[PDB]
Amino acid sequence: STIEEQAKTFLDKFNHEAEDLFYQSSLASWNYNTNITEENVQNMNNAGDKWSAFLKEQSTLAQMYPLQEIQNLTVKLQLQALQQNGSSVLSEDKSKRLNTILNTMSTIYSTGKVCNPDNPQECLLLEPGLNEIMANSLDYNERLWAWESWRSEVGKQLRPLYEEYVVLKNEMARANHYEDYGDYWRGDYEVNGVDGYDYSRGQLIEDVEHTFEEIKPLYEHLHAYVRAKLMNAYPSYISPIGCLPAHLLGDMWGRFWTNLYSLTVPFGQKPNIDVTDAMVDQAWDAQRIFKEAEKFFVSVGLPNMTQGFWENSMLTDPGNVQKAVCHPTAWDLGKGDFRILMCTKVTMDDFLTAHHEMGHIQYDMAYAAQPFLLRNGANEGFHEAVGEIMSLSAATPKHLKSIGLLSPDFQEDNETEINFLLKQALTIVGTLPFTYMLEKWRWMVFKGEIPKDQWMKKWWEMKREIVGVVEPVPHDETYCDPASLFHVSNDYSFIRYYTRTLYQFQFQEALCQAAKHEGPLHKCDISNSTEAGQKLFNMLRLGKSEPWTLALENVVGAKNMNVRPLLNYFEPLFTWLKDQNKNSFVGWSTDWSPYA
Amino acid sequence: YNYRYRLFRKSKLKPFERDISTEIYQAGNKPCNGVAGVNCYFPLQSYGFRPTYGVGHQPYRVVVLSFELLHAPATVCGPKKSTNLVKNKCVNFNFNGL
Ligand SMILES: *[C@@H]1O[C@H](CO)[C@@H](O[C@@H]2O[C@H](CO)[C@@H](O)[C@H](O)[C@H]2NC(C)=O)[C@H](O)[C@H]1NC(C)=O
Ligand SMILES: *[C@@H]1O[C@H](CO)[C@@H](O)[C@H](O)[C@H]1NC(C)=O
Ligand SMILES: *[C@@H]1O[C@H](CO)[C@@H](O)[C@H](O)[C@H]1NC(C)=O
Numbered sequence: 001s002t003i004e005e006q007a008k009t010f011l012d013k014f015n016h017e018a019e020d021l022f023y024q025s026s027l028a029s030w031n032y033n034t035n036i037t038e039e040n041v042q043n044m045n046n047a048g049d050k051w052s053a054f055l056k057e058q059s060t061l062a063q064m065y066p067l068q069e070i071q072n073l074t075v076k077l078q079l080q081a082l083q084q085n086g087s088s089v090l091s092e093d094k095s096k097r098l099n100t101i102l103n104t105m106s107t108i109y110s111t112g113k114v115c116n117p118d119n120p121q122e123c124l125l126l127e128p129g130l131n132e133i134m135a136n137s138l139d140y141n142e143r144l145w146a147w148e149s150w151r152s153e154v155g156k157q158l159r160p161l162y163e164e165y166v167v168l169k170n171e172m173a174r175a176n177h178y179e180d181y182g183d184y185w186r187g188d189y190e191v192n193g194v195d196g197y198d199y200s201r202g203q204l205i206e207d208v209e210h211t212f213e214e215i216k217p218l219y220e221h222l223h224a225y226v227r228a229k230l231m232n233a234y235p236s237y238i239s240p241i242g243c244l245p246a247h248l249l250g251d252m253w254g255r256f257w258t259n260l261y262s263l264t265v266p267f268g269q270k271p272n273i274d275v276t277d278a279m280v281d282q283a284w285d286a287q288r289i290f291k292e293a294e295k296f297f298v299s300v301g302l303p304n305m306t307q308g309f310w311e312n313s314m315l316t317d318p319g320n321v322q323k324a325v326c327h328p329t330a331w332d333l334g335k336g337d338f339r340i341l342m343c344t345k346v347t348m349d350d351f352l353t354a355h356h357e358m359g360h361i362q363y364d365m366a367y368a369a370q371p372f373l374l375r376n377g378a379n380e381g382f383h384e385a386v387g388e389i390m391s392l393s394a395a396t397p398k399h400l401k402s403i404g405l406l407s408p409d410f411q412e413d414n415e416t417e418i419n420f421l422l423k424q425a426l427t428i429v430g431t432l433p434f435t436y437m438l439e440k441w442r443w444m445v446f447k448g449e450i451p452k453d454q455w456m457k458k459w460w461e462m463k464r465e466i467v468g469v470v471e472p473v474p475h476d477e478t479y480c481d482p483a484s485l486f487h488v489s490n491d492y493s494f495i496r497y498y499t500r501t502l503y504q505f506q507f508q509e510a511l512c513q514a515a516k517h518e519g520p521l522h523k524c525d526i527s528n529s530t531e532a533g534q535k536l537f538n539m540l541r542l543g544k545s546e547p548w549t550l551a552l553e554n555v556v557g558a559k560n561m562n563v564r565p566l567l568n569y570f571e572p573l574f575t576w577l578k579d580q581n582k583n584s585f586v587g588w589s590t591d592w593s594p595y596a
Numbered sequence: 597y598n599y600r601y602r603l604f605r606k607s608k609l610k611p612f613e614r615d616i617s618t619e620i621y622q623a624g625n626k627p628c629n630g631v632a633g634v635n636c637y638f639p640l641q642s643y644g645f646r647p648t649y650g651v652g653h654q655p656y657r658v659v660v661l662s663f664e665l666l667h668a669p670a671t672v673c674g675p676k677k678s679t680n681l682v683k684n685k686c687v688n689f690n691f692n693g694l
Contacts, residue, residue, distance in 0.1 A: 017641075027646070334653055335650050
């Protein structure tokens with residue numbers, strides 16, 4: 001007769017009733033995404049609608065159990081997630097407005113952009129594949145032309161839509177008792193239950209700002225070295241004493257700095273560690289790639305992959321003209337119906353991402369034992385962190401030698417491992433400032449911290465203060481640069497990237513110290529180290545059922561954003577690079593004026 | 597959806613006790629007189645077996661072969677084990693208890 005038992009019975013009904021709807025939606029989505037055709041394209045409509053209606057009905061019904069008298073923490077968190085009705089908590093007019101805004105953003109993303117009539121032959125630099133990595137070659141003026149054209153084609157069109165989205169979402173969050181949309185985002189990382197392990201939502205910002213400062217010298221020296229090493233696409237306005245333009249750094253927005261690789265590695269005589277020649281010579285296909293990747297997780301004690309994974313999953317030869325989006329995907333359906341969506345070709349990136357997707361699937365089957373509202377990563381950035389740490393370890397030269405893809409007599413030295421460290425530091429060290437500044441700008445805007453003064457100048461000065469890159473041309477408020485990115489256009493979480501970046505190296509150092517290793521971290525292979533696998537499984541099993549503080553402290557000693565493992569991994573690079581920066585000074589001029 | 601299971605009951609079923617009835621279960625503080633509603637849920641639910649489910653959710657057929665002995669003659673036995681028969685030889689034999 002007590003409220004607790006009634007809530008227990010209601011959750012026992014809801015967890016069973018949600019499984020069939022979730023499986024229907026997942027299977028319809030998988031079948032549609034495997035091959036785009038009308039007969040299964042139309043299925044996704046009803047599949048989504050039925051699931052949304054059932055969730056809305058359950059959320060409306062879940063109201064009569066108050067949250068005050070709940071004493072069981074499991075059902076407390078379950079109801080807190082369930083009582084978070086989301087888009088169903090407010091009126092219908094705002095619901096359809098938000099749906100229309102999301103549809104407009106999706107159409108803007110899907111619709112391409114064409115150049116001026118003087119050269120309309122090719123204007124699709126996005127492409128349905130990995131070709132988006134390389135957009136323009138070693139250029140100086142038409143690269144900024146492409147940059148400004150894309151910015152003018154996105155921001156001038158999406159500024160008022162984003163402003164109205166911000167207004168309506170702030171109203172939503174205020175209705176749901178949160179301070180703002182940033183409060184709603186931070187609520188995922190907050191724990192208000194068990195004492196001692198408690199973490200408030202307002203502590204994440206200070207934790208991030210405290211953990212970012214311990215790596216500022218590393219980023220400063222790396223950026224100074226890169227700027228000195230460019231030397232070719234020199235800034236025509238500012239001498240190399242000052243800062244550098246932002247467009248040259250690889251991608252469209254500079255999120256990743258892999259493209260700069262070929263422009264800055266000093267030891268060109270020593271080739272990068274490659275297995276492609278052995279990959280082709282030994283007749284390696286996708287099946288062999290995935291078998292080899294599975295052996296890695298089998299060695300560390302993780303269970304054998306379920307039979308039927310290869311049967312159900314598709315990974316080669318799309319065949320149909322309307323090919324699927326070849327981006328990697330890991331699909332979890334019901335229970336035991338784990339599968340992958342892949343476009344394997346024998347390359348570096350595919351081999352690297354195979355382990356990332358394997359880690360995704362492994363985390364999924366590790367936390368599958370939890371109830372429906374709990375089978376997920378503890379933090380928004382835990383899943384990618386688990387994927388990337390396994391992705392980062394198998395690429396060790398020792399593992400390649402053990403596999404046989406590398407020469408048995410091949411010897412490493414202070415010339416090759418430094419190149420490996422530089423290559424993996426371009427894709428990690430430079431990504432932290434971008435994510436950090438983007439998320440802090442997001443939290444400032446969504447909470448109304450900034451005034452109506454044009455947010456673009458604040459964003460530019462903030463990026464040049466953190467990322468240390470000056471914008472090429474001045475801009476007014478008519479542009480909206482961050483929305484040009486997919487995860488801002490579709491309103492996805494962004495701090496998960498920073499959490500992934502730090503947690504990857506935290507668990508790496510923990511499991512590698514558990515892996516009885518001596519010397520630098522980047523040479524240790526966690527293969528045949530069962531204790532590291534058990535330590536990782538200690539946290540992988542919990543999922544969202546336990547506070548993330550418990551999931552982080554039970555493996556690594558610290559409870560918060562401790563960044564020492566990253567520096568302990570990348571210290572040899574820093575020590576070697578200090579010799580190069582013996583003359584190359586460190587420090588950028590934030591007061592730089594490109595217009596002058 | 598031809599398989600169903602019960603999810604709510606007032607008391608734990610006694611050994612081998614069966615309750616096939618489908619009366620509305622009252623988990624709330626007030627009766628609902630057979631009307632489905634808040635805290636009054638249908639005590640039967642469907643599996644919805646799909647054929648792409650994993651091993652942990654695939655439909656497993658379960659048979660519980662139970663043996664019962666009471667104050668009655670044992671009319672069911674399993675002595676399905678017999679050898680050949682040879683005559684004109686001094687041998688051991690067990691003819692159905694003889
Ligand atoms: C809270 O409710 C659960 C619901 O069963 C109680 O049962 C525990 O559930 C946890 C799963 O989170 C198991 O690890 C425990 O072994 C279960 N214990 C028992 C005795 O069944 C749980 O006891 C309740 N209380 C707490 C503090 O969790
Ligand atoms: C995993 O499965 C494969 C094929 O099903 C089998 O050959 C292998 O021995 C298994 N490994 C373990 C550790 O069970
Ligand atoms: C790990 O174990 C496998 C098992 O055969 C072995 O082949 C491999 O050399 C081992 N790797 C290391 C680094 O010891």
